[PDB]
């Protein structure tokens, strides 16, 4: 009609997809410990005591992980925090010298101290002696240390070794006061932006979400780092979800998300002693002087029955996407040590656990129910000190030994699998999945799959019958 | 589970003609041409997009479970074997002759 005029509405509920800078927010209770944690440092603003989550009822929004910029941002922050925390620490340039290593000799009895009989660390470490520099440059001292065989590579003239990193890059020594404990991080938006949250219980990565809600900060996200199994995560609400960018493309990793947590219990039974030498002015090197008392390979404990079930429900979901084919799990076919073994952290000691008993099975048809009694699965693990977790992108690190015995109990929340292709043999009613794959980004897609950053547009133009009164 | 089949095994198109080769594919499809004992090169990827470098002579189009590779203004140097490729499944192809 002629009676309609342009009216300006302020405060309209409208948004667009956008990308912005998310800042950190962490709980104060985890703060004021003076432990100088790497990840959620003092710079994070205190979290809101009363978070607001608003359910938007008649709203359908298109969500798409695998294209979420919240994941790429978290990658930059995680690497950036890692590098700066290591900047003030001590370089280990003087340790790139020739090492003369021999078999370790120890004094104890310690008749295995427990049921497991995996083995002993002897034949897994070497006793290496070398020349370093005293605080005075023109004086050299001969010292010794116990190095893991994984950290030393023989060059020539047998019984003469060197550290692995000495031909790739220099490695800094993690400062003693630095803590590796992952504490939750809340990613928040500036004013004028918002985060949409998908509340659907059974929701894959992409597609419309009919139960969107509005928040201002994500839930606490732990930066826990792992390779084959996601640990200490958040369980699924409805049931097991198989999420993959394209299940047809075998180059894309499959993320399995569990609705029932499975405990993994890892310990380092040995008893290492931390001793320090001076390699230069103001530079001190922490080494494993001796290992007295208990000597046994590190291991992880898994309840056998729980894994069977958790492995049995998963194949149930897999059979839906692969209807007429049998599903089998196999150990990784090769790659770096981070790919072929379950890599994680525990009190600053970096583990590499085998996990072949967990991923060696075949599920032909489930013709009959097979029953077995409870057993504990012991996974042999190895410890490493020269650490390169960012695929040769960040700063290499040397982890000083931790005094005493080490024990860590953590949940298993998901699995990263990698289906293998084929033309004729692979089509003979069989599908093999192998653990591990992707990168560290997928360790955080599993947490940020339900979020989406948008920008608010509070200005609205509408036709009404109200006309501005001219003077 | 990818199903593909190239019905024309071989054909004898003359010089200067326009000839179409059809490949069915349940997924992404790419087009390669390979000379006698040489490395195949990419002409059309996704079934419609032209590669940077191939002349405008080559072109293909899609409708349903069927793709077409069209070579208008055939040349004596455009004689080779042509592939329709899905992720890891490849068919023998078709060979050209005058």
């Amino acid at each position, epitope marked *: 009609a002629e009676n309609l005029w342009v009216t300006v509405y302020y405060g309209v509920p409208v948004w667009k997809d956008a990308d912005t800078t998310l800042f950190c927010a962490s709980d104060a209770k985890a703060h004021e410990t003076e432990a100088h944690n790497i990840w959620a440092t003092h710079a994070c603003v205190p979290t809101d005591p009363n978070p607001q989550e608003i359910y938007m009822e008649n709203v359908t929004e298109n969500f798409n992980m695998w294209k979420n910029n919240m994941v790429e941002q978290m990658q930059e922050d995680i690497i950036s925090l890692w590098d700066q925390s290591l900047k003030p620490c001590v370089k280990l340039t003087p340790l790139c010298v020739t090492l003369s290593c021999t078999n370790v000799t120890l004094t104890n009895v310690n008749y295995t101290n427990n049921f497991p009989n995996i083995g002993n660390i002897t034949d897994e470490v070497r006793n290496c002696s070398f020349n370093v520099t005293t605080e005075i440059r023109d004086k050299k001292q001969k010292v010794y240390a116990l190095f893991y065989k994984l950290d030393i590579v023989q060059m020539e003239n047998k019984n003469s070794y060197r550290l692995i990193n000495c031909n790739t890059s220099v490695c800094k020594q993690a400062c003693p006061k630095i803590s590796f404990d992952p504490i939750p991080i809340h990613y928040c938006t500036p004013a004028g932006y918002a985060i949409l949250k998908c509340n659907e219980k059974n929701f894959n990565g992409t597609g419309p979400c009919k139960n969107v809600s509005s928040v201002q900060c994500t839930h606490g996200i732990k930066p826990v780092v792992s390779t084959q199994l996601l640990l200490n995560g958040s369980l699924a609400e409805g049931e097991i979800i198989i999420r993959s960018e394209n299940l047809t493309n075998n180059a894309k990793t499959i993320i399995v998300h569990l609705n029932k947590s499975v405990e993994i219990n890892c310990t380092r039974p040995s008893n290492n002693t931390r001793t320090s030498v001076t390699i230069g002015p103001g530079q001190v090197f922490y080494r494993t002087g001796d290992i007295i008392g208990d000597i046994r390979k590190a291991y992880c404990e898994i309840n056998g029955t729980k894994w069977n079930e958790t492995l049995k429900q998963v194949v149930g979901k897999l059979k839906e996407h692969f209807p007429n084919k049998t599903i089998s799990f196999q150990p990784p076919s090769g790659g770096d040590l981070e790919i072929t073994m379950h890599h994680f952290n525990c009190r600053g000691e970096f583990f590499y656990c085998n996990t072949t008993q967990l991923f060696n099975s075949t599920w032909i048809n489930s013709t009959t129910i097979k029953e077995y009694n409870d057993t504990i699965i012991y996974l042999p693990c190895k410890i490493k000190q020269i650490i390169n977790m960012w695929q040769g992108v960040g700063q290499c690190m040397y982890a000083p030994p931790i005094r005493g015995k080490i024990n860590c109990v953590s949940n298993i929340t998901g699995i990263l699998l990698t289906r*293998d292709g*084929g*033309d004729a043999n692979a089509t003979n009613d069989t599908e093999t999945f192998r653990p*591990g794959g992707g990168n560290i980004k997928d360790n955080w897609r599993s947490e940020l799959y339900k979020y989406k950053v948008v920008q608010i547009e509070p200005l609205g133009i509408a036709p009404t019958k109200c006309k501005r009164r001219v003077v | 589970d990818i199903q593909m089949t190239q019905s024309p095994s071989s054909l004898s198109a003359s010089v200067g003609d326009t000839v179409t080769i059809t490949c069915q594919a349940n997924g992404y499809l790419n087009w390669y041409q390979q000379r006698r004992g040489k490395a195949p090169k990419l002409l059309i990827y996704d079934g419609s997009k032209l590669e940077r470098g191939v002349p405008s002579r080559f072109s293909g189009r899609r409708w349903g479970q069927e793709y077409n590779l069209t070579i208008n203004n055939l040349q004596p140097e455009d004689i080779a074997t042509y592939f329709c*490729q899905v992720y890891e499944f490849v068919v023998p192809g078709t060979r050209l002759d005058l």
Partner: nanobody, 121 residues
Framework: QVQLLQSGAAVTKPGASVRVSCEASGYNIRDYFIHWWRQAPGQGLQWVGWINPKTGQPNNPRQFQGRVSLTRHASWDFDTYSFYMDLKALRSDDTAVYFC????????????WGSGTQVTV
């Protein structure tokens, strides 16, 4: 430019092993998968597997399990890479030409191919 330099042809005996090498120099090698293709004489191409250059993780069909071992070696500054392919047990069926190809995107576009290495027994 971008180039995938191959090695020369190889002649071996049944039951022996072979080592085919492919070298990539002129791009960011770490961000693109490298696939290996097998073309028997008088037949079409066959897929051998892909290797993740960042982590070295391989992936092969059931046919090539326990025989093919895909490994890569990276320069100090990652300017150039060397990709290797090893066959453990050889038969008459393994005579073919082996190509190293550079997948470009999720379409599996192999824009760059190696010259080819003739392996015969």
């Amino acid at each position: 430019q971008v180039q995938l330099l191959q090695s020369g042809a190889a002649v071996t005996k049944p039951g022996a092993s072979v080592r085919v090498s492919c070298e990539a120099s002129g791009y960011n090698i770490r961000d693109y998968f490298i696939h290996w293709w097998r073309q028997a004489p008088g037949q079409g191409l066959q897929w051998v597997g892909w290797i993740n250059p960042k982590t070295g993780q391989p992936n092969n069909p059931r046919q090539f399990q326990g025989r093919v071992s895909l490994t890569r070696h990276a320069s100090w500054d990652f300017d150039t890479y060397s990709f290797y392919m090893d066959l453990k047990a050889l038969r008459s069926d393994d005579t073919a030409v082996y190509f190293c190809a550079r997948q470009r995107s999720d379409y599996w576009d192999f824009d760059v191919w190696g010259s080819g290495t003739q392996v015969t027994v």
